[PDB]
From a paper:
The NSP15 endoribonuclease enzyme, known as NendoU, is highly conserved and plays a critical role in the ability of the virus to evade the immune system. NendoU is a three-domain 34 kDa protein that was demonstrated to form a barrel-shaped hexamer in solution by the assembly of two trimers. The oligomerization is mostly driven by the contacts of the N-terminal (ND) and the middle (MD) domains, while the C-terminal domain (CD) carries the canonical catalytic residues from the endonuclease family. In terms of substrate specificity, NendoU of the coronaviruses is described to cleave a great variety of single- and double-stranded RNAs in an Mn2+-dependent reaction, by hydrolyzing the 3′ end of pyrimidines, with a strong preference for uracil, and to release 2′,3′-cyclic phosphate and 5′-hydroxyl ends as products.
However, the most drastic similar effect was obtained when we added the DNA oligo(dT)30 to the samples in Bis-Tris at pH 6.0 and in PBS at pH 6.0, where we saw the immediate formation of 2D crystals of NendoU in the frozen grid, which somehow had induced the same pattern of arrangement of particle in all directions. Due to that, we tried to use this condition to obtain a crystal structure of NendoU. Furthermore, the same crystal pattern was also observed for NendoUmon and NendoUhex when incubated with other DNA sequences such as primers (data not shown), suggesting that this packing is somehow induced by the presence of DNA. If we compare the arrangement of adjacent hexamer units in the crystal structure with the low-resolution processing of cryo-EM filaments, it can be inferred that they follow the same pattern, with hexamers positioned side by side in a C1 arrangement. Furthermore, polar surface structural analysis showed that this pattern allows the perfect battery-like piling of the negatively charged S cavity of one hexamer into the positively charged switch region of the adjacent hexamer, indicating that the biological function of these two regions is related to the formation of large order supramolecular agglomerates. More in situ studies are required to confirm the existence of these molecular entities inside infected cells. It is important to state that despite our efforts, we have not been able to identify any electron density suggesting a complex with nucleic acids.
Author numbering:
A (entry chain F), B (entry chain A), C (entry chain D), D (entry chain E), E (entry chain C): -1 to 346
The structure:
């Protein structure tokens, strides 16, 4: 019972696909969907994907509208496909996954995750949906989220935040912190101890600890002496150096957040996608100090404190591997005369 | 219940829309409709209309596949819209009429021709469809075709030929000669006595009389002598004059057909549509003689001879009006010393 | 290095992709690839596929330009992908297969057929290429073609014809008849005894036997007489019945070819793709006889005669299965009084 | 006042741009120009150029509709632009020149060829247009064509053929053979003695000498015997060798013409543009013999015989330079034991 | 390597074109460039120019990322083309210049500025690049920028600001104030004494003098009294009249910037491009006062005061010419009773 006119009826009446009966007249012009509302055409969807307009429209309408893991987490866990749902990637304005299982005729590789083709793929399961926990139990490769405990399975506590309709939030009325479980080649895996990125933005930044509040308030000198971290190069790494043409350091989001409020700047997101580490072309509107590739991570300041604190401070050049969002991130631990010169995410 | 996927299912399985239940996966890219057949995309329709691709696709699938009047006839009779069908214009690769009645949700102005909006429009009715003759009786404005007599209605015998899937033909296995009836403001009109164009092509030209057979096989001199056409300027009008840079006469299709077998030429159809009189930009390959606007009509040679021989040849110039395909066609008749100089469809 | 400009250089200089170095300036406008030749733009390729224009262009340039199996054969044998080549499908003006192996960065699922992902896929291997016979021997699933005998394996003699740049031909200067080998789950299969379709066209129809020559010159009667096919309903099945509004029989290409010489007709290829049995919407220009779905097969007349003469005519209706192009084709055989009434490819 | 609606009015009424006053309603959808005729949209122009649709439409409407030099001639003479006209390239379906002079606001570089910007460009003039001969006299760089003699100027007799609305022909009702004149940096230049290509087609080939008539009628052996061409490898060069997988010779159009009538083949024009030497990807339907880049020239057989018989047969390999269509064409001459092995247009 | 895939590799890895080796898979759909990153397509560039998508992409990647003159400065100086770089026009999201020199194969008119074609063009040269000062010395027509003195050349001090990645700024860590040099027909020109527009925005308007701090904080009456501007019509010219249906005056940005803080309004930029004087369709949200064409200039208030105080107030109407951004701006000065009535940029 799948139809373009039925999908559009659901968008018009329910705000998304809700499996209701009915049809509305539709027009497809360029990469845009229109419907008629009292003699005039109303745009329902503009295709920004590489998929045909009508398939992209159906996938978008059938997106999961409950709090779901951020696609950065699903990419880091090597998630290939979702079971009987669509994870919409709001950063790319596209579905997170290429193919589907029991969602859309044009993209389905199967109707059920139990099919042969699905076995080598890491299938995403949502324990909030009836029978999905059991499907995970029968799956060869998969990743599972639950709100509560599951019989005989040790959980991994996930990030506090999840995405709800493109809004990353820590739910108060709804649950966003999930238990994570993973299977590889039929065997349940132990997920590693990890830090999580905080997924905040520049324009409306929110501190999530006293140290973060203190960072945003206290001056450079006062903060460094208060939380005691003299030789860890916070002046360069976190605060940033704008004295030269080539902008120095500034690899922590909170640092960008502090600079933004006093003096704004331009961030060019030349690779627009959700990732644990982001690369931007930054131009400071105040000094004219710029950097083409500025790698930025949003870690809780306390976590970054703990991370920098915990290192060697010996070898002139080094690589440190930290577990962030279940994946391993490399950092260039440069050193000279026994103190931190810089610390930043690895590029080449 | 209209659906793009159901329309496509009918096209794939039945060759056109046949009201069967079922769905196929469809992709819309550019102005092209594709369907998935054994994992690969197969083109079903390329939109050549000014309507949205999906709308054009549905109208094309729902086209009338029985012998129907040629578009030029419907246009000449002032038909604005069809009752519960689509007349596909194969010359324009588009629907003959802008709007529909009980066909498609995007183009319907009504579900039934009895609706108020239809009253000022000349609705085309097909007597071969149950109840359409009665709908014509109730219609304020309309045109009706039937295969047989209708109670109380005087008929007009139409052309021998009709269009079947874009093929103009004189039916032997099927009926193509219809009775025509017309109503204006509730009053049945007397259709005029008319000649009909023969709707033939240059490549597969077929004579339809002994005189036409004689025209194609005999030489210019003998034909003119045999049929006593001496002062009627057929040398110019029909045979054409290729001696000067501007091509002279050549306004009868049979004349173009005769020339074509001898030496080919180019015909630029700069207004591509069905019309009683066609205008072409002609270039003769052998001589280089050309004409920007060469008006061409396909009349049975016998009819053209009857027309020209019915004229008074006493005036230098005069406008001659002839009813053809139910419309009044104006010709320019130029005479000198009691003989014809030229005779051509008037363009000014 | 794989580059759009290098691919275009190869096309301009060599007609296709070869592996020579160089670059030409390229413009991509709409779905068209252009190159600058002496200050003006020259169209090199128009994308008619569902793939991005530049991707389709690279795949087309990298097409196999040696005689290759026709797509219908590969499809019937269950070929999913080709090893280190592109089988272009000239019926769809698109690549025959979705993905590639060592061809193009955008479509490659592997660089080598030995990779894990390839194991469940039936890979096409060309014995004329060094090491491909051995790759087939190591492959789990596959289809191999050779010009000569393969040590140990009983060959299956393929069709006499193959495709060379979209030209289906029986090679005299080149080999077009291949030996076929097939492997399923590591085990070599015995290919069935099969008939092959002749892959001819209506316009340039060439008889391939004396019977076919006689069919085309002799009259229906004289031909039925000569070959004694009185109770085999050739009048209906092969010649076709144009006496009613719906076209009777006409399921053999040679039949269509015979009628075409006499009187032309329209064939609407509503599913444009290579298939053993083709379905057309046919309209006879002379009679007006038509049929929405007319299933047409191009069998050598001698083979069709052998097929029909091999059947039992004791039952009113029965399903007849014939191996054609390595696939099982179902026919509907209708009898009455020990003679054939009709025989046609089954669809319902 | 130049306008889109006026350009279209002129096309609908005159078949091209004729400077008549008036307007018609226009729609621009995709790369297509439509006009409304009795409530329905009629396609007037489909843009196949790299210019904007409306610009291409105006240039096409304003194309020269009198016999003009073929594009290959203009290109060989180094023509960069036209004076107050548009030379339409029917081979590319685009204007022959990028920029214009007193034609179109969007493409104009000047209103008059006397403007400074035009001085280094070789601007084309037409002596058939009032004042153009004098403009050429004031021009720094230019190419002039005339029907007759010009005061105090030596003429170069051009090819017998010219292009008229995309039809290459030898005029009988019109003059196609022009006198050619050049000026480079203000000085009138003596055009070289040259051969001219005949610009004929495969499907409608016409011999233009007794030797050409003899070539088409006589068998290979007796033609070579009659014209004493024994050691000139005509069997290879002209007739072509179809015995091997790679196509042997076949570099003369007349040779292709002779083969085609006997047995057809396919010619892929992978660089679609007008040039003295054309490159095609050829596949012989009978044998399967093919060649990726088969360079073809249409020389009068008598001219080709004169060329080949004028060569010294003493060296194994040598470059032969021939002036054709005012340009120097390089050929490769291979000899053995005092007889020619092969001869062909050089590419690498 | 000059390739689409290499350009895209550079963008993904370096944030722009950096001449590094490598390739990334690219897809071109519509006017959008995508790359495959971990199995999913990521948008890198959307073409908003009139150039082909791939050309525009290369041109954008190869943009100058160092502080450069604003486009309006370059246009005012008559710059036609830039030497071995691309000046990206961020106002139009397109290259500032049509053609290039040693940048891109599709747009290059030369590889070096020393080529003949470049001689009549005013080439932009950047003294910060090795050898460009010398190239200017050899150039016929050019414009040069330097950070310091150039021996033998008298400089013109340019604006304090420059554009860095679309950000106009006064550099503190980088130099944004350049020395300007110009030459026509081989002779070095003396650039005129000029005022410069301050290139500010309404949103984040920053005063650059005490008079400007005051304009923004004091009330209209207090400000005019403090700076003794009584008969200079500042109420009309710099504050604007919102009492009538048509907006009065408001031709200074600071004025718009002062209103905006109080009450917002709409500015329709119907000619979106960089220009010394901008025209907007302004609608005041509070009053409903509007003006279709409101000419706005960003002069430092002190400069505007100096300009208006330098005028003779004896004539009713008068044209006032002021050199701004190296160009002559015409103003329309209206006086009555020895006081200013209005003063505005003249449009005709």
């Amino acid at each position: 019972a799948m139809s373009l006119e039925n999908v559009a009826f659901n968008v018009v009446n329910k705000g998304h696909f809700d499996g209701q009966q009915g049809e509305v007249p539709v027009s497809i012009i360029n990469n845009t969907v229109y419907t008629k509302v009292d003699g005039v055409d109303v745009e329902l969807f503009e295709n920004k994907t590489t998929l045909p307009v009508n398939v992209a429209f159906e996938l978008w309408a059938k997106r999961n509208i409950k709090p779901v893991p951020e696609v950065k987490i699903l990419n880091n866990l090597g998630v290939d496909i979702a079971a009987n749902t669509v994870i919409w990637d709001y950063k790319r304005d596209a579905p997170a996954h290429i193919s589907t299982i029991g969602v859309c005729s044009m993209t389905d590789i199967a109707k059920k995750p139990t099919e042969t083709i699905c076995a080598p793929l890491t299938v995403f399961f949502d324990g909030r949906v009836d029978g999905q926990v059991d499907l995970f139990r029968n799956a060869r490769n998969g990743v599972l989220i639950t709100e509560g405990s599951v019989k005989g399975l040790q959980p991994s506590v996930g990030p506090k935040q999840a995405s709800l309709n493109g809004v990353t939030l820590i739910g108060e009325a709804v649950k966003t912190q999930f238990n994570y479980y993973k299977k590889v080649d039929g065997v349940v895996q132990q997920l590693p101890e990890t830090y999580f990125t905080q997924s905040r933005n520049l324009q409306e930044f929110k501190p999530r600890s006293q140290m973060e509040i203190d960072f945003l308030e206290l001056a450079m000198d006062e903060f460094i002496e208060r939380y005691k971290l003299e030789g860890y190069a916070f002046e360069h790494i976190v605060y940033g150096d704008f004295s030269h043409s080539q902008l120095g350091g500034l690899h922590l989001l909170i640092g960008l957040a502090k600079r933004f409020k006093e003096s704004p700047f331009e961030l060019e997101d030349f690779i627009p996608m959700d990732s644990t580490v982001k690369n931007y072309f930054i131009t400071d509107a105040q000094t004219g100090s710029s950097k083409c590739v500025c790698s930025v991570i949003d870690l809780l300041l306390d976590d970054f404190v703990e991370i920098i604190k915990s290192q060697d401070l010996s070898v002139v050049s080094k690589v440190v591997k930290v577990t962030i969002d279940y994946t391993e991130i490399s950092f260039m631990l440069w050193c000279k005369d026994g103190h931190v010169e810089t610390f930043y995410p690895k590029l080449q």
